[PDB]
Amino acid sequence: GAMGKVTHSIHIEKSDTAADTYGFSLSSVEEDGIRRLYVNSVKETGLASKKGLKAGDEILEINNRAADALNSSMLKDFLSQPSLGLLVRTYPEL
């Protein structure tokens, strides 16, 4: 592979309960005045893993909205739903 940007669109669906999780976390990181959202972890046995979400992927959009336009209230709202759309920048592993 090389340096080209590759994005991955993911749609995850699950039961609507407080016991059924996607199995991933995200972080907000600021560096030199630019904020990015990253996949912070992916549970090895979870739905997000099954769907090919990778730790270190950069989240570009959630549910058709730019990551930099997302606040914590929006994230809570979106993440509590039984389906979720993610657009991530993803890197070749090697």
Binding site: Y22, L26, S28, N40, L79
Partner: peptide, 8 residues
């Protein structure tokens, strides 16, 4: 540093 973190 990370500002914060959410899981679902």
């Amino acid at each position: 540093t990370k500002q914060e973190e959410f899981y679902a």
